[PDB]
Amino acid sequence: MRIPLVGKDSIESKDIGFTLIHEHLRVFSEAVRQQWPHLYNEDEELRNAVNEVKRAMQFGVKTIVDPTVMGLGRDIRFMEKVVKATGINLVAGTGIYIYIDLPFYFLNRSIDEIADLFIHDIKEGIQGTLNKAGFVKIAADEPGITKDVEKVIRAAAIANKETKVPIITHSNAHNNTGLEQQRILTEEGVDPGKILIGHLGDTDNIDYIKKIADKGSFIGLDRYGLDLFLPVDKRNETTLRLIKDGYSDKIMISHDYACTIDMGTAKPEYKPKLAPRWSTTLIFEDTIPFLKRNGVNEEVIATIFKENPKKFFS
Amino acid sequence: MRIPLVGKDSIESKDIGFTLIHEHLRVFSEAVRQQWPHLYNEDEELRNAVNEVKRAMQFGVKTIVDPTVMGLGRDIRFMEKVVKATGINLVAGTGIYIYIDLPFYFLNRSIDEIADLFIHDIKEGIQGTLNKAGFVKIAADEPGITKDVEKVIRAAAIANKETKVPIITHSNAHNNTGLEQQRILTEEGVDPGKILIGHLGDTDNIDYIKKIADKGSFIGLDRYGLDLFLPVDKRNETTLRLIKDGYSDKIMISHDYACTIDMGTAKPEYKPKLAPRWSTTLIFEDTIPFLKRNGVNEEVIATIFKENPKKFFS
Ligand SMILES: [Co+2]
Ligand SMILES: [Co+2]
Ligand SMILES: [Fe+2]
Ligand SMILES: [Fe+2]
Incomplete structure (x- = not known):
């Protein structure tokens, strides 16, 4: 009804229940996994996520918000499998996770073009699926607010608005x-x-x-x-x-x-x-x-x- | 023999013939393509590569060396398709292409771990295939020789030796x-x-x-x-x-x-x-x-x- 969920109908924010606001099902570097797959094992990764989520649910966790986005190896089809196996409410996000510079793709590209990517994920869906993004994730760290870091921030504001x-x-x-x-x-x-x-x-x-x-x-x-x-x-x-x-x-x-x-x-x-x-x-x-x-x-x-997660998504 | 080729038996360096030493069949940012597939068109990309390579072959080009590696969107199966459609000798490589920092994967990893990735591609194969890398590609640009850039250069040396x-x-x-x-x-x-x-x-x-x-x-x-x-x-x-x-x-x-x-x-x-x-x-x-x-x-x-490409690969 308002918050999109992975592999589920959207829900009203009042129905979010006990929530963990920042947890990752799986994190990896896109380029490394793509270039050297021998380093990874999806069977284990799925088993690890499913087991961890079940432990959380046993304590009463109803919703998990997973801020894995570009730069952390977001994979919507992996997330679907976890939901399928656990029944957890999973909120997926869009955005870009960088510390210094954007990928070369973005050279000579406007903040609007970036925001368009986030808006695509929110309105159309993630990675060719109908699973929609429920928030935007952005980053900054030791290097501070670099030019590219700032561009990503302003794109997130556009997507929010x-x-x-x-x-x-x-x-x-x-x-x-x-x-x-x-x-x-x-x-x-x-x-x-x-x-x-x-x-x-x-x-x-x-x-x-x-x-x-x-x-x-x-x-x-x-x-x-x-x-x-x-x-x-x-x-x-x-x-x-x-x-x-x-x-x-x-x-x-x-x-x-x-x-x-x-x-x-x-x-x-x-x-x-x-x-x-x-x-x-x-x-x-x-x-x-x-x-x-x-x-x-x-x-x-x-x-x-x-209450806080409820207000956050309201 | 000597030089491994994509989709073909290796050849003697003496049979390399007229060679273009640095050309790319396709370039893209791994993370962007993975997160936003809607931006790309495989069919058109293959068409573009196939037609261009054919024009080069009509002018006598026998071998193309393609230094597309991690950070530039290396894809060995796409390279296979181009070979099948053109008959070109294609030398693929391994290595890493960065200007500043390595992907987070490499945090707290040795120069040896990096070299091991290159040696895997050279000795075992690329991205789970039997196509072997015939050289290592590394990069540096405007930011100069950063710590991570330098780490990659030394890993290349290990792989070569x-x-x-x-x-x-x-x-x-x-x-x-x-x-x-x-x-x-x-x-x-x-x-x-x-x-x-x-x-x-x-x-x-x-x-x-x-x-x-x-x-x-x-x-x-x-x-x-x-x-x-x-x-x-x-x-x-x-x-x-x-x-x-x-x-x-x-x-x-x-x-x-x-x-x-x-x-x-x-x-x-x-x-x-x-x-x-x-x-x-x-x-x-x-x-x-x-x-x-x-x-x-x-x-x-x-x-x-x-002659020069011959010596280079001898
Ligand atoms: Co964080
Ligand atoms: Co170059
Ligand atoms: Fe996090
Ligand atoms: Fe190049």
């Missing part, structure tokens, strides 16, 4: 890329309440995080388990502080888990050190119980995982 | 990247005679061009027709001067034509302005006749287009 789908971002918590994404998007006419600034939970700099929330956007405390960015304990402490300071209606929580990911950083012998407890269920095992025994009312849990 | 296949490079004629590529490769123990420093025809600075030939590598006067980089008549005067100065033993000539290319810069609109006479038969129409009118004999032409 045309289709009203919200925007999810990837940012670096330590260099103000998040605040800049927000500024540019809102200058382009995007409603601040239609923006989730991502990976802000990677820092304990509470003052910076509040600055984005005060400007009306959702803040992504969304990498629970990725200790190399910030340990779980510190994340919980920051989350609790924000809630106590009255920021629960701006907070969104997730793991940014990748059921399978091809980056060398994700090698098995690195897990114990970088992300020992990383998964899509960590928050049920740690974060939520922690909050409840620290004076946080159930109503606040309901706000973060149900 | 292991398998003996030659290396073809892409460089920017104005920033010393070509000379730097040659230095790094030779320091790694690569035979200079197994290196083609590419795109040197983009400049008329013969002092710089000669510096590379003097160190033992082939020089790529390889973008005939691409006037936006350097107009035909200027390339001709440079080519002629080099021959007159005795450098025909290091000279290689080609067009770097792309029968189909998805970059905005290559739109049909811009062709008349940026590269009006660009194609795989330009050197037969203009360059070769021009050299002959200026006293260059048949032997020199045979040296450039038959």
